[PDB]
Structures are given as C-alpha cells and as structure tokens.
Amino acid sequence: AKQSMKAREVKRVALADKYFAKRAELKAIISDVNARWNAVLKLQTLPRDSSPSRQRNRCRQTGRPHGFLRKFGLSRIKVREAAMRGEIPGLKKASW
Amino acid sequence: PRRRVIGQRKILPDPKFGSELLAKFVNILMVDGKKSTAESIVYSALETLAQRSGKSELEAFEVALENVRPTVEVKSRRVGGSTYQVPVEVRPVRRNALAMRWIVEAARKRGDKSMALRLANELSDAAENKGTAVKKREDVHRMAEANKAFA
Amino acid sequence: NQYYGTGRRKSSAARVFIKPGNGKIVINQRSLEQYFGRETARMVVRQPLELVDMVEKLDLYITVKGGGISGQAGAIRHGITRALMEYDESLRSELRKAGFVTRDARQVERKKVGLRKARRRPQFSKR
Amino acid sequence: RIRIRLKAFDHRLIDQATAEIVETAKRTGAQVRGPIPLPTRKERFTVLISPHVNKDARDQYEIRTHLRLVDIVEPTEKTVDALMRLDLAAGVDVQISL
Amino acid sequence: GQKVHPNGIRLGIVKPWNSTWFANTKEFADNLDSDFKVRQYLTKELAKASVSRIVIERPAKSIRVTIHTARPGIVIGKKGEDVEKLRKVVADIAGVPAQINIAEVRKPELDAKLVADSITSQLERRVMFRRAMKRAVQNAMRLGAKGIKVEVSGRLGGAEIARTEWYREGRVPLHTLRADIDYNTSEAHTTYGVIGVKVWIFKGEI
Amino acid sequence: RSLKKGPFIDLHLLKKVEKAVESGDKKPLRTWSRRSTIFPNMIGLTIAVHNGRQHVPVFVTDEMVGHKLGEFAPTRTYR
Amino acid sequence: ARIAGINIPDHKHAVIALTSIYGVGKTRSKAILAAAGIAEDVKISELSEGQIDTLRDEVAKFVVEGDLRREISMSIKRLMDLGCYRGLRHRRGLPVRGQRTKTNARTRKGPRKP
RNA sequence: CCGGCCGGGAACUCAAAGGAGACUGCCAGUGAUAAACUGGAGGAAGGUGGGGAUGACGUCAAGUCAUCAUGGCCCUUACGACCAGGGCUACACACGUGCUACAAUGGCGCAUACAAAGAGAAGCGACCUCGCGAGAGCAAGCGGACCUCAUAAAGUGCGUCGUAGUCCGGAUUGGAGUCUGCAACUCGACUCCAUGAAGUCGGAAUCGCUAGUAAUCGUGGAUCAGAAUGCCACGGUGAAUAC
RNA sequence: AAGAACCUUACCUGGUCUUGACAUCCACGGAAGUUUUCAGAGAUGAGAAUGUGCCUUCGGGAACCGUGAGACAGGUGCUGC
C-alpha cells in the first residue's frame, strides 16, 4: 500500500539531498543580506521538493506517517514487534 | 477506610514556642504548601494579639482556642425518618482542629486586607467571645440542642 | 575525630564543618545574615539543625550540596547524628528515642501514563 | 595517557572488555589506573501498543548505553602489537584518544 | 489481546538478545534495516530449511550471522556452495564484508519457531488442527520439556465463524520471569483465511 | 510579522506584471499563487486571485501595497 | 495633562490615563516613566509643564492619538468601497488574526445568543 | 586568581559494578497447642517499605481491512497517479479536558539563593559587540560527568501598591526580529505597545486525591525547518481528615 | 496525530495512462548523469551543450535512462459481523 507516497518521499529525499543542499544553502546565505532579489528569485526557480521542509520522515518497513521514531527508523508498531522479538539490540521494557 | 484506620503523623513542635498546637494551627492555615508565609502570618498575629491582650502568645491562643472548641456536635446518622442529625461528643483532637478550622475561615470571612491583622482580630474576638467562629460554635451547639437524639 | 557532614534527605548531601566554637552559620564564605538570615522558614529549617542538641557549643559552616532547603536541613541533622555516634555511642539511644537517626525515605512519586501527575487522573465524564 | 572509551549496551560485555584491556596492560607490566564508570545513558522511548486507539495504555522502552574509560598511564609497543582484534566482542564500541 | 510477549519480558533477564551490535544514533536505524533485509531474505529463502533463530552480530566493520537450524545440511548445501552464495548476498545486502556460521538446533520439537512452522505447514496441507496440536504437545512432553501451550486461532477447518482453540500440557508459567519460555508464532496462508499459530514451551527456571 | 531581507514576489507574477505594465493593453491576469506582496508597479491592474472555480478580480490601488494578494479574496462562504 | 483625549491624571499615574486614551500603547507609558524617573504615585498637584510638553512631543513623535479608529475605519471603508472581503470580514466582527471562533472568541461575539 | 584552581590525597558527596540488609527474624500478649493479629527491642528502612512492569479462563461479534498482512467483492484511459490552490483552522448555540484568573497568603521594583531528568552532528551553541526586545554578526568547546542547551521557579531581605477590574489578562490592521523561502493572506509563535472585555470565588449538579499524596511552584524530552496551555519525564515547599 | 503554511493529505482545477507514481519480464535505442533557454500554476513539454569512460569467453555484460504491445500493476476503495 501507499506506494505513491513511498516514491514521493524517495523523490523529495533525492531532490533535496543529492541535486541540491549546496545550491540551496548558498542561495539561502546569499538571500540573508551580509554587508526582486536574485537569491529569492533563483531559490524560487529551484524545484520545491529540494527543500528539506518537504520530507515527512516516514517508516521504512510499512510507511506510517505517525509514530515514526528517528532513532529506530520504523513505525511504532514495528519497533514494538522487533523489540519484543529481540531484533533491536538493548531495547528492554522500562519499569522505573 | 474499611479495613483499618491509619494513625496521624507525629507533628513537629513550632520553633519559637515548642507547641504542637501552634504547629497544627500553622499546618491548618497554610495554602499551596506555604509554611514560611503561614508561620510568619501566625507570628505577626500572635505578636499583635499578645500586645493588645496583655498576656503571652501561647496563652492568648489557648484562651481563644478554648472559646472556639465546641463541646457537642451533630452527626448525620439518620436515626429518625432516614434523615436525622445526632449530637455526639467530639474527641479533643477534633475539638482543637475544628477550633483552628473555624478560626482560619473566620479570618478569611473577616474583611480586613492583611490576613495577619484579621487573624489577630478574630483571635481577639474569640478571647472576648463575639466573633463569627464562635458564632459557628453557637450554631453547632444550637443544632445539637435542637435535634437532641441520644445522650 | 573531626565532626563532618554526613547523610542524605530528599536530594541533598551534607558538607558541614561543625567544630567547637560560637555557632554562627556561614555559607560559601558568606553569612547567614547576608544570605537569608532574617528569612522566615530559615528558623524552622535551623531547628532540625539544632534538634540534635549538640549545637550549643559548636560553630557551624554549612555548604550542604544539592536538593531543597528542608532536605538540606535533614541532611545536616542526620550528619550531626552519625558524627555524634562516631564520637560516642551512649547517645545513640536518645537520638533513636527522639527519632532523628531515622532517614526519611519519602521521595517524589513518578508521573504515569494516561495521567497528569503521580496519582492525579483526568477528570472523568460519567456520560 | 592512552585514553580508551569503550561503550556497549550490556554491562557484562563491558566488564569483560575492560577486564581484557586491564589484563593486557597488566601483561605488559605498567601502572594501570582503575576503570572508572561514566554515567549510563537511559534513552527512553514511549511507544503506542494499540494500532488504532489508546492514550492511557502504552508501554515504555529503554536503551541503556554503558560507558567506562580505562585511562592507562603507560602505553607501549608490545600492547600496540597485541591490540589486533584484542576486544573481539560485537556488543562493545571502543573509542581511542592519545 | 492482553498478554505480554514472553521474549520481551524476559529479554534482559533470561532470554538473550537476537541481534548484538552497537551503533550510534546516526547508524542504528541503517543497521537495523540492513539486519531486516538480511533476515527477511534468509527467512524467505530458507523457510524450507527449517531455520529457528538468526543472530546477527556486527563488529561495525563486518557482519557475522549465525543461523540456528535443525537440518544443517540443506542450509550448507553441497560443499558450502549454498551457504557461500548466501554469504555473498548477505555481503551485498549489508554492504560490508560478511560471514555465516551454522549452529545446530538439537531437539527441533522443543524449538517454538520450528513447531509453529510445522503446524503452519500442516495447516497449509489441510491436516486437521486438533491432530497438529495433540502431536505437538505429545512430542514435547515425550522429548522432555516441563510444559507446552499451543494456541491455534481463526478460521479453523473452514468455518465462517473464527475460533481460538488452545491445547495445554505441563507447566507454562508466563508470569514468572525467572522461567525460560521460548515463544514463537507462525502464519499459515490458507484458502479461506489466515490461521495463526502461537506456541509456548517451558524448559526450566533459570 | 514577515521578513525584512527581501519583500517576496512570485517570479511569474513579476514577469507578467512588468509585461502588462510595458504593453499597457491587458485583460485580467489569472494567478493561482495568492501569496505575493503587491509592488507599486501593480497599481493600475486587476490581478485575479484564485477562489473556487469562480473569479475574484482585485483592482489593486495605492493603499494595497504592503498586503499580500489573498487578503482581499475570500476562500470560505457563510451566511 | 489632557492632550487629544478624555482621560486625566488625578493623584495617580499619568501612564494609566495615557494608555486609556486610544491611539497609543504602553511603550509610550514606559518611555514617559523612564524620561521622568520619579514616583508618579505622588499627588498630581504642581503637575509639571515639562511633563506636559514631554508627553505631547512623545505622542507627536510616535503614533498620535486617535489613530486606532482611523485605521479600523479606513480598513473597513476601503475594502467595502472596493468590494473585497477583507474589510467585510472585519465588519462581521469574528477573529481573522488566526483565532478559533467555534466556541471561543466570546470577547468579540459578546454575550452568547441562543 | 582564594575559582579545587594546583600539587597531592582518596577521606567523604558522587558515578556505576558486586555483595549485605527486611525474613514476622527475636521477645510479650491474644488466638487451637495452627494460621494470624496487636504492640516492643534492634535497625536507614517492619510487617506487599513506596512506586512500576506483570492484565488468568473468558466477555463485549468492542476497535483496526487508515499500520501491515489477508478471504471475498469492486474500480482499473479510474476508485491508479502529479501539480497549483483550498479544506482539515469556519460558527446560532451546548457539554468533555486543560490553561489565565477574579488579587493583599497577592502583585510591582532592587538584591540574593537552593535541584533533578534529558538532548546534541544539516545538531547544541557559549565569551565579546550591536540592539528596549524577540534576535543579529563574530563564533570557542563538543558525538558528551568536560562544552553547549541552561546566572531554574515558588523561597526570600527591603520598599511601594492599601478596591484595583489589579501586570489577572482578553481585543481586527499595524511596528517588528526569527523559522522555511512553495510561502507566516485563508494559517505559527515571540517583549508583541496596539483601545485592558469578562469574572468581586461561581445554581442544580459533578470530579481528582490517605503522605511526599492532594494543592502549589518551576525545568527538560519526543513530533519536528518552525509551530503546545496536549502528551511523555523531572525536581521544591508541603497539607487537612478518617469517629 | 509523538507537529494541518506546501509536504503530510485522500475531498475542488489543469495536465497522464497499456505501462501508468510504484516492481517483474519481452523487444529496440542510448552511459548514468551535469548545465541552460522558452511556454505554463505546475511532475508537463518543446529545445540546446558535455559525458559513447565502468567493459563483454565483445557472437558485448553493467546499477541505469527513454519508448512500445501484452501479461501486469495499482486502490488511505467496501465488508473487523
């Protein structure tokens, strides 16, 4: 399921991290004035998916938008399943 | 507390006079866990009540407390017609505690602005037997004599 | 022995260099009267400081580490208890009878899932 | 002066590895400072158990990263020769400074 | 619906962690997904070899994978050709140099993964669930475990109303954490629905 | 409330607005991007904000400079 | 000191009457407080003409009084004349600064009307 | 350098590994010569020490085919898929949760204290300078008991406010820094300067809590370019009453 | 929902489908890619410049790209009774 969003997220990851993140960053620091504007116009003429704003950081085995955790890299249900099965090293239930 | 009642905690004495009674007055009067403000208002009121009364702090508190202690107090036991109030003798801790509670509300009901000053005012009122805490005591006693049920 | 700071209460640990002399409390090379000498509730934290009744001839420099003020007072008190048993063991029984050798293990209960506080539950709608 | 920061998820692996390094320095015969413990990083994750609806019933997980630093006084060439796969435990990550 | 995963409640106490490595916050998810792609591939590739447990250890340069199997011969193949092709594909999934060890699972009926996939295979082959569960508990009680609980669930025997039928022998103390219970599930993809099999096996109190 | 490094304008709108000013004979300009601050070059033009399938035409004046294009344009309806 | 308003200091602070006059804020009040540097809780007898002139020039240098009604009036009026909805939605009186009015914003909407 | 800062020391707080201790163990009474109950000595802890994780056979054909997988059915030049924009943010009213309060046990102004937990590599950002300010530029130390986030907040010592709609804070378009520049109009917050409404402690009813709990006071996390008074943790003072 | 300005994100306008945004083959051509112009709200096109390196027992094999028919996709569509 939700393969459209999978390839959309792959699209904005490859458009942000690979084609750009140097051109966008240089245009951003040109845009903040250091002592109509060319940097604002050229950052518009860059594609919108290049912006790191666009990426919704999403689950790797399923694709749930929510309950994603960056450290484990999967959805909440999937980190429960791998934790209870022992795939995640050091993950034990907390009881303090 | 169906199984077992729990005994009350041992109460520290107050630092100035060594009185668990004055400490219980402090603990009753505090709000939002503010012991510093509570005991400062207590000391200011005890100083003003003592200088107006001409006796010591603990003795003025004792006479005022003795006037706010009730002797008889009703309790809803519903012995007549499933709604009745029965007068029962009140144990000395509940006498002193009801005295302190009726005092601290009588302070709150008094219209003076600073609570140390009105706290000394109805302490002086109880020492002369005319404040609204002793009004509550008279209402409780009149309700006991009104609905006398058992000895 | 040199009578020193021992013991814990809430989140504190005592570092008092209590020593024979006239007791005037100095904190971080600065006076009680400069820090909070005329503060109200200083007296009722200083009363457990005195409550071991070996403060009558003992000068106090107090730099108890960590935690809140009443817990710091309990740490100081517990330290004078443990140091006085280190001095002589006949007065252990009287501090036990008064109840000062007991550490008060009461501590903050933890927050809990589906609840605002340690015990405090959401206001429940019957409907 | 050799500053070795070894970190793992299990304290038994940590103690085995730090005893091995202490054994290596003891085998070469140098003054060894004791392995000090550095504080455990309890990274807590609070994760929903129910796929669809819950707020009150939820379970909490922890990763515990342990840390010791050995801080041996004297390193030597025999230990540098004997370092090659001396640790040999997959659970432990070892960090080195001069 | 309301019972804890036994391996999760015994993970630091009795049962060992399945994957053992240390990665930082920047590489942990990337290693975890690499482990999942290796594990998924080797499971779907040697489900016919009856693998029980896969432990993956990364020393952060290489990968060492141990496959706990009842039948080591089909996992090895001939001359290690199958396991060397496995080693190569594990190397390109992990992206780092690889190594495979084969640890054997003696007494396959005492391993819960093997019993779960055995009952799953029979349920795909339309053997009856009651015979599968009685066979499992009888074989474990013969082979020497202290107890076994077999839960089968859902669409049993082609009925429209799903039901959960549990068969229990011996002692299965789930609430006691000092006990070792290996619990593993399997999923049979039948014609009318999917039949899920859960087995607990109790071997002792550690 | 918004940035001072540069007043933002959409580049397609800037090109079409300067072309409309240079020609002097233009129809309404249809623009879907509603998030542009009005330049003083825009005065003397109707620039159409996107609302619905329907049309909202705005004749921008001397006062409506600092405001964005969609303030004058209603997206929702009510009684 | 009455300038362009209805309020007057009376044995009290200039700043409360000044902020009661619309068209300003309280940074004028804080600035007059910093310019005087004296206790304004004292009696307003011998009210200083220096205070009156500094009050006047501070009001004149900053946004003068009476401009709030001016701003709301031109806002509603120019968008009502031009036919656009920005001044119409200010006439309707519900919050458009970004606020929820589903059950809140009773300060705008007044008493609740069943 | 009167900063442990510097030699030293490991004596203590600590940090974190392994043990010990708390078992009705001892004594007395009650009880059947049992279980147990009630007190006492010892002791930091006393009789589940506190809290947590742990949710039995089952029940509601409770929830999820929107996490996934999956049987049957349907769309498949659309019921797939991309972009701009919009909606999820509206509003006659009604309740459910929480926040700010109606002040004087409180504000407001000067000075002075005492924590814990956590995070950090496109990340945390000191010191200095410029700004009323949000922040800007220069920018060390840092993949961590160092460095940074981060001189907590109630507590205060003196004053002043002694009906004040009070710093209790509501209210469109501005005057602004900052985030991403698809872009702060429909739509973020922030000292915002924007006119200081209401509420002078609240009817029938109703809810949460037996001890560090209630109440109050502040702090950090996760989601995350930003966007909490919600959720997930942490500390301070500290109740009252159980007949 | 542990993050609604776009994204997320399904409901309103333009653009596209026998390989679709997304994998597998069968057939043909081209390295992959980098930098630009113009139209347009824009994945959409229409054009330009440099890279045929990686190699095949070269009877040419690459991760790949573009296109064509078929199988095939795909669905946050319905039934948790």
From Swiss-Prot, chain B:
One GO cellular component term: cytosol
Segments forming a coiled coil: none
Keyword Chloroplast: no
Task of the protein: One of the primary rRNA binding proteins, it binds directly to 16S rRNA where it nucleates assembly of the head domain of the 30S subunit. Is located at the subunit interface close to the decoding center, where it has been shown to contact mRNA. Has been shown to contact tRNA in both the P and E sites; it probably blocks exit of the E site tRNA.
TM helices/strands, residue ranges: none
Keywords from the named record: Ribonucleoprotein, Ribosomal protein, RNA-binding, rRNA-binding, tRNA-binding
Effect of substituting M115G: Significantly decreases affinity for its own mRNA
Phenotype for K35 to A/E: Defective in ribosome assembly
GO MF annotations, alphabetized: mRNA binding; rRNA binding; structural constituent of ribosome; tRNA binding
Quaternary context: Part of the 30S ribosomal subunit. Contacts proteins S9 and S11. Cross-links to IF3 and the P and E site tRNAs.
Protein name, UniProt field: Small ribosomal subunit protein uS7
Source organism of this protein record: Escherichia coli (strain K12)
Other facts: The strain K12 sequence is shown.
Similarity field: Belongs to the universal ribosomal protein uS7 family.
Gene Ontology biological-process entries: cytoplasmic translation; negative regulation of translation; ribosomal small subunit assembly; translation
